[PDB]
From Swiss-Prot:
WD repeats lie at residues 80-124, 125-193, 194-235, 236-306, 337-372. Interacts with USP12; promotes translocation of USP12/WDR20 to the plasma membrane. Component of the USP12/WDR20/WDR48 deubiquitinating complex. Interacts with USP46; contributes to the cytoplasmic localization of the USP46/WDR20 complex. Component of the USP12/DMWD/WDR48 deubiquitinating complex. It is found in: Cytoplasm; Nucleus. Regulator of deubiquitinating complexes. Activates deubiquitinating activity of complexes containing USP12. Anchors at the base of the ubiquitin-contacting loop of USP12 and remotely modulates the catalytic center of the enzyme. Regulates shuttling of the USP12 deubiquitinase complex between the plasma membrane, cytoplasm and nucleus. The keyword Nucleotide-binding does not apply. One of its GO terms (cellular component) is cytoplasm. This is WD repeat-containing protein 20. The gene is WDR20. Keywords: Acetylation, Cytoplasm, Nucleus, Phosphoprotein, Repeat, WD repeat. The keyword Glycosyltransferase does not apply. GO terms for molecular function: deubiquitinase activator activity.
Length: 376
């Protein structure tokens, strides 16, 4: 059980580039908490990638230099210290990013959400400041796809809320009115004001949601074991799935949106067909909870929009897995086995991101790592 710094697949060698590392400038391993999370944004010239990540009380904002030597950690573009409630997750707005400005949403432990312009720095807005909408920790925030102003935030309590950046408040707790009830979910409105709708799903924590690559559907995974995928604009259940044990912790779509992938408290990744609403396969490999699942849009034969797939997963077992699902697997319930299953961290993995030049992982210690793709 020793750490690996590289692995081989059909594409060649992947290699941990330690001089691309990002972290706290101090550089000492963080130990205690809230998961370390990572967001990337582009600003439409040469070095226009930004990285944001969080640690304990610190939010950092840097230039991300991909597979090159990392930008000087001594001098971040922006840094925030939160002395009360601490960050849990965050999301850039890819629609309104520019060199002059980016909209960063940040969610917190006590359920607040902050909007931050880490570039121009003349913007800082609080949502749910008095905690009257929800007291429980934010688990996930996402700008609504294709939107300049709407975002969706999930909570520990089992709810999601829709917010408009441009609206306010409120000063009193919202009086809700039903709009749809369904199999294990409801949706409410209230009666220019800031939670637009409250969206109750299943029972227990809403761990993660992910929009379909076309933004038309929402996929959710809860502490009750359910994957639930909605028709976002329509607001109605499209299909569900339950694991045999424990809750589902993370989700992702295939880059063509035909497949949903979950990872769970039973250590399995599950593949699930969006059109057939059936489970397509399951993969054993993690020796513990699967904490992140992602499709690799750069090693897949499908053309995205507006046959093979690659995805990966990282878990609390400190391991990375990669997975192929082919025609044999898709169109013959079968068991995937990982192309690779390496230990790559000293502590629980919290980030899996597939970029064009590389793969990015992070661990709970606060180190953001870059993995050079073969030939890059």
């Amino acid at each position: 059980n020793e750490i690996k710094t590289q692995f081989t697949t059909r594409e060649g060698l992947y290699k941990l580039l330690p001089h691309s590392e990002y972290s706290r400038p101090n550089r000492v391993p963080f130990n205690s908490s809230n998961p370390v999370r990572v967001s990337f944004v582009n600003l439409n010239s040469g070095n226009g990638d930004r990285l944001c990540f969080n640690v304990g009380r610190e939010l950092y904002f840097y230039i991300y230099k991909g597979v090159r030597k990392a930008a000087d950690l001594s001098k971040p573009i922006d840094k925030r210290i939160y002395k009360g409630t601490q960050p849990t997750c965050h999301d850039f707005n890819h629609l309104t990013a520019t060199a002059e400005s980016v909209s960063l949403l940040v969610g917190f432990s006590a359920g607040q959400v902050q909007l931050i312009d880490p570039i121009k720095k003349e913007t800082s807005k609080l949502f749910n400041e008095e905690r009257l909408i929800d007291k429980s920790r934010v688990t996930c925030v996402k700008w609504v796809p294709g939107s300049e102003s709407l975002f969706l935030v999930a909570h520990s309590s089992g709810n999601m809320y829709l917010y408009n950046v441009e609206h306010t408040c409120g000063t009193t707790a919202p009086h809700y009115q039903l709009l749809k009830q369904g199999e294990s979910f409801a949706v409410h409105t209230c009666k220019t004001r800031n939670p637009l709708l409250k969206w109750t799903v299943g029972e227990g924590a809403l761990n993660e949601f992910a929009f379909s690559p076309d933004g038309k559907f929402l996929a959710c995974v809860s502490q009750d074991g359910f994957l639930r995928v909605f028709n976002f604009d329509s607001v109605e259940l499209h299909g569900t799935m339950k694991s045999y044990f424990g809750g589902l912790l993370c989700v992702c779509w295939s880059p063509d949106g035909k497949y949903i992938v979950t990872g769970g408290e039973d250590d399995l990744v599950t593949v699930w067909s969006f059109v057939d609403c059936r489970v397509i396969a399951r993969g054993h490999g993690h020796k513990s909870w699967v904490s992140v699942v992602a499709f690799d849009p750069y090693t897949t034969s499908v053309e995205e929009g507006d046959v093979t797939y690659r995805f990966g997963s990282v878990g609390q077992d400190t391991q990375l897995c990669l997975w192929d699902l082919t025609e044999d697997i898709l169109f013959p319930v079968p068991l995937l086995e990982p192309l690779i299953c390496k230990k790559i961290a000293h502590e629980r993995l919290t980030v899996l991101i597939f970029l064009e030049d590389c793969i990015v992982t992070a661990c709970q210690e606060g180190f953001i790592c870059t993995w050079g793709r073969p030939g890059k």
